[PDB]
Design a protein around this ligand. Sequence first.
Ligand SMILES: c1ccc2[nH]ccc2c1
Ligand SMILES: c1ccc2[nH]ccc2c1
Ligand SMILES: c1ccc2[nH]ccc2c1
Ligand SMILES: c1ccc2[nH]ccc2c1
Lengths: 401, 402, 396, 401
Amino acid sequence: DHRALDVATELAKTFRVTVRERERAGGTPKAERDAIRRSGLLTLLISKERGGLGESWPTVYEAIAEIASADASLGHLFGYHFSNFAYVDLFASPEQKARWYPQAVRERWFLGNASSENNAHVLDWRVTATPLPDGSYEINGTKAFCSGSADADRLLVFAVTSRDPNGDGRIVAALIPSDRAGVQVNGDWDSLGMRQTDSGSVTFSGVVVYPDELLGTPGQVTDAFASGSKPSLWTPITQLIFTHLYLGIARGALEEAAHYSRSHSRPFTLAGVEKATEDPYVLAIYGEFAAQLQVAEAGAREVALRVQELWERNHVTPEQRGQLMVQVASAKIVATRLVIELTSRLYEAMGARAAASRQFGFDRFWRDARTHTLHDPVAYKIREVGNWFLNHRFPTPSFYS
Amino acid sequence: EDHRALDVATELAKTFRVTVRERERAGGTPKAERDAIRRSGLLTLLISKERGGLGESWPTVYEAIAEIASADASLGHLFGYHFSNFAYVDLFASPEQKARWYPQAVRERWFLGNASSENNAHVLDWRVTATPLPDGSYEINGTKAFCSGSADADRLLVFAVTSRDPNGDGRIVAALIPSDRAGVQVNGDWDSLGMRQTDSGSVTFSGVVVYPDELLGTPGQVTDAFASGSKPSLWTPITQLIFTHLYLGIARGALEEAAHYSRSHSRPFTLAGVEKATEDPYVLAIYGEFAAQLQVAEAGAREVALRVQELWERNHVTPEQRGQLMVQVASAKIVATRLVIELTSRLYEAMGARAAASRQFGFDRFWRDARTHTLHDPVAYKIREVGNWFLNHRFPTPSFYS
Amino acid sequence: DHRALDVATELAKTFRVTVRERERAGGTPKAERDAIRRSGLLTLLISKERGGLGESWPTVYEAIAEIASADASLGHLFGYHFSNFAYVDLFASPEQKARWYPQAVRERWFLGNASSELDWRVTATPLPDGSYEINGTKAFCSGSADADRLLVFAVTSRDPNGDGRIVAALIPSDRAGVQVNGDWDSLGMRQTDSGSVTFSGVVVYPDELLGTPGQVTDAFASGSKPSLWTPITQLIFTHLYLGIARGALEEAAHYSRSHSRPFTLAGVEKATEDPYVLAIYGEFAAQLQVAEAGAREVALRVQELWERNHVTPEQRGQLMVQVASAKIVATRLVIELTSRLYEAMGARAAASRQFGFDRFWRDARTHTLHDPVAYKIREVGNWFLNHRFPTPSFYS
Amino acid sequence: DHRALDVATELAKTFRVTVRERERAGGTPKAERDAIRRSGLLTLLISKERGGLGESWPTVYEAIAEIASADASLGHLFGYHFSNFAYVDLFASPEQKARWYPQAVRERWFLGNASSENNAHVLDWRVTATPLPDGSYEINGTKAFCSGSADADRLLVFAVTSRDPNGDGRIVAALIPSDRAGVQVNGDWDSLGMRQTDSGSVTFSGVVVYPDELLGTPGQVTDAFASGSKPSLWTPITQLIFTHLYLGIARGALEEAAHYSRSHSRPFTLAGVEKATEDPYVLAIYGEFAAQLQVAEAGAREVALRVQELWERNHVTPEQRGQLMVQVASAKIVATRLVIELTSRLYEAMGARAAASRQFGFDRFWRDARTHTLHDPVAYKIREVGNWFLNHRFPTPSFYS
Ligand SMILES: c1ccc2[nH]ccc2c1
Ligand SMILES: c1ccc2[nH]ccc2c1
Ligand SMILES: c1ccc2[nH]ccc2c1
Ligand SMILES: c1ccc2[nH]ccc2c1
């Protein structure tokens, strides 16, 4: 059954036609986000019983890579939607799922994030939740890197409790409308790459969050991650989403370069080459990177299958979660090194005119990859894999590991 | 999910690790270990159960090769090459030949040797000639180099070029013959940097008669299969993926052995402000970089191995199927080659000076083994082949190396 | 005597203030080119006897790198000026130089190129009085805007004495028939005005010609002193790449000191104490130190041979090998450093497009493609393995 | 004069003839050490007035690299002799120089080390110096990695004071005869590479050190290093010696590979080239490594000239010493990466037969380089250069930085 993947492939084809012009402007790719809404793919992981497609994580990951190969910003938005959905599904109550999931199908929800990317200790988080009557909370503060925060049907929001008789310093998460009073999407995203992901800041001014919007009790995510209960799959799932962004960009860059080489590169006739496509060093560049891409992609498919396997389990052991996170981290490390090298070095196969003509726009691939690969430092993913291999220590679960 | 065969290979590898350091110094023929492999039954992994074999798959074979190679690269090589030789026989032998040979191979515990599918020369430049005799036999003459596993071999897979042949000179003939056939001399002239117990020296054929029931196909049939990209040309991707698993196995064995050394000799650098080398950020980074690359390379290799099995089971294979497989194998080999050559050298940086000051530690065996065999055929042309496919949509030209 | 270098350092300091906004616009950095004119440094290699500074190639190369570290386009324009000057000096007669060089000092000449860079089809048709008419369109004409003179190359055509012979001339950029097309819109090197120039019936007078037709080809085939132009110019490129590398490293370090946060899971209090941040700076700073030190030695050898009356193909070939080696190392270094330093700075260095650090990669990524480093590598390999010096050309 | 370098070149040629058989056996290369004695080059830095050659550090460094290119163990021994000589010369009194230097010419001293390479805090040093009457000290203990300790005419020895009314924990350095009673060279060097450097352990049993053998007063080296006086040049001098071992090994390996390639120019059967010396990928391997070698050697010559410049100064500032040490560390880092990569990857240019015949012996270059590059961890030389560049901190003078 390749129906969903065919739909994603067709979306990506349409995105390729316009990405060069669209991403220069930045801003919100509303038309393309609506095209994704109409495709139904946002419901890939919602059961057929609840109106979704009843598909699997391997399909999601392949769709993410395909879309990202055409437009990295749309790939990012699409993949982040599923990271946000994964968080919801891992913490939501039975009655929340019975209400939200049919509604997400009917209303074609595209989920945004504000924000699960807090590069700081919990007591230093920008956004605080203070109690209101009847179990509600009030959210205040400004957070940056709110991925996909424009045109979002719901925002997955995070805050730390304050002035709370039931405990200060606890992480609360909630899924709220983006037009709730006091939510201000600031529109300040102007980035090197990932230019159409609307990953700017969001300011919360006295924003009300109701109990039926809270995703577990305050502090539950800390307990679930540290214990290795099922929600501890969120981070390997999400880090593998990022991995598929990088592999998608890598494949799109390699295929765009090859098209240029076949139609535009002149041979270095000084060295007796009649066609650039027959040049031994041009061929070596393509071979080195296509070979690494093939292996990285084949490996990523295996880890995606393991995500699905553990996703279906009722309980996951620390060894099972830790081995998965190590495999994901390994795939991310290899994909990061590959995409960053490839998107820069492929110019050496294409020649000077590929850079002399700014309009060719090939630098988009490097810009997009160079931007998002910094989400969290690959040096610490490397350290995490090393600490496991040498010392048998699995990574400490967190929002980044 | 039958893990019995892989358990047997794991136990074999365990025993080999105990003695490999002393054995590989001596070189020569690891007869005791070859006999342990014979007793294990694993040489029959790919023979059908109907013919007395284990009826297992290429994924199992490849995993077993990597496991054994991680303990002893020469024994992994010998074991892997046995299946390369077996694959050639299976792809070219008649059903009648197989009906006789495979039960015999099970009963007599055959360990196959090679003499030799590694020529590195145009057919006209081959040293070993096959002169036709009136009954359809061929007389073989010449000295063949790089005859891997040629010592203690129950049968040799032999290649020669026709000479003085009214039906055409320069055609490749292949046969499977006893190693004690009159005129066969295994020369034992192997004294190498690494892969020191693979007996990859020369074999001299002096008037060796190979009989018609030992010939594999007709003269030149392997060249025709290569030109067609047909199923018998699967021999090369199968064999190149065997090599890939030797390199992944050596890499895994090296990384684990290094980790063991680091944990038990964890003296930190004075100025480094570390209490333990196992907490040093730069030691951890070396292990992490190489372990990550190893995980991805291994996971990728498993996928290519499943595809080998799929096409192995087909009655017919198209050049497009064969070419895509060869590109995928070449890609895996390229990554595995770069990985094992970098890792076996750079892990010293994580272990520290005493790992090299003590020759007896013997860790350089991993680099020596990998550095030797990765030269079998130049990785630069595997890279060119993948690039020519990706850029120009040209599949590699089938050959004994591509 | 560091007076010239001090002038270059102060110019570079001024250029840093404005480069971020200027290079976005592209186009011609007229004000900064005029600052270079006022500095006198365009006359670095002209003898004091002819009104110049009487300085050495080592000083020129250090000034190029310094300016390039601040503004790669201005570094390129400045460096190319000296490539153009080197060509004039190697081929012009003493009588021509006695006129041109004091004029270049008085009129503050900034030389442009059209063009030093396979098969050339801009033609030079001989006229009876020794003049030529130039026709055709050149590409990649670096510094062709606001140029006091253009160094122009063409091949003879309709020539009873032999078609296809290369002629070179130094002509005013506003001579009738010269059209600078203004079509440069590039990834990096955005203010180098390296677009196309169209020649329509452009007259070249005999006293503007540099040597005789085909003389440059003869000099390449002989490996004689004028063939030094290529190693001189390839080492100019090398110093652009080393300068960009140093500028990028320093800009990154400033960001790391003033803006980088420690990764929350690092267990370190300051990003400047993070072991992996320190390893990135150390690995690239170390390579830069060795590359810069080696480049200084090769620059001294350029000067030594520049002063010789005659140069052998063995002297020229050995120098070219050393220049190629430096260029290879500098190319790899600058391309890796300008991309990887983001990993020492963090996500916010890319999240804020206005920071503009990608300029370094864009500039280096653009100009390092001038000629393929793969063939510089092959040339060094062919020398080391087969004892064959590079075949002299406009690229080797 | 190029006399000394001609002498070194001729020595190196002789060593190449026998290095394969000698390094396999290990042990002491006595005949070759005596050849170095006959050459006079051990006296390169002794003034002509004291009987030496009156030469300079740039000459010494070139000679080290030339000899190392032929035989890394002899290059190491020769280089370490000059590290030992530098230490002596930086601390010896006028009386000691007047006595020792003519004696070193006449007796042809080849200096050994036992040992300036203590990977441990001063208080934790293996070897102690306890006061004796009349200003003598008694040395007791075992130190490992005593480079060139066999057939050494004098040993440079280091110990820490104890039971010393004038201060415990102070570093004493002395130059003593190797046949002084109580000195036991243990002969336990059996290494991967550098196999003929006799870098095993030395045991001191009640060894007497007289006042006229002491190199300064106890603790003077620590004062000199901390102050940046002239003896603080010892570490950059010595680390640049190691750098020249690595560049020498690199050049020797590259030249040996090229000779093999030229005399075994068998092209790969399917390469489509007539000869391996015309293969594009063979040429790329030689070009990449030859290019890096040219730049590293040129940079090393510049740093050697700076060593000589500061060597002649009466005073060196902490900035001058720190800048030199940064330049030396940078050279050592680059040379380490280059030699380790080159000595392994050049097999790819030569082909399978270069490894199939162990007797070819090319692996000696990798084994020698792989062994000595671990002397002190390159990761911390990298950190030191990074700490300088990013934080403007020069390395703290020590025996390793
Ligand atoms: C680094 C770069 C871009 C990004 N968009 C959302 C997160 C994030 C992190
Ligand atoms: C080619 C290259 C290296 C080798 N080691 C054992 C066999 C063999 C063949
Ligand atoms: C001028 C400026 C940039 C360039 N890139 C390649 C050539 C070239 C010339
Ligand atoms: C002398 C010889 C070889 C060595 N390896 C590490 C240190 C050291 C010292």
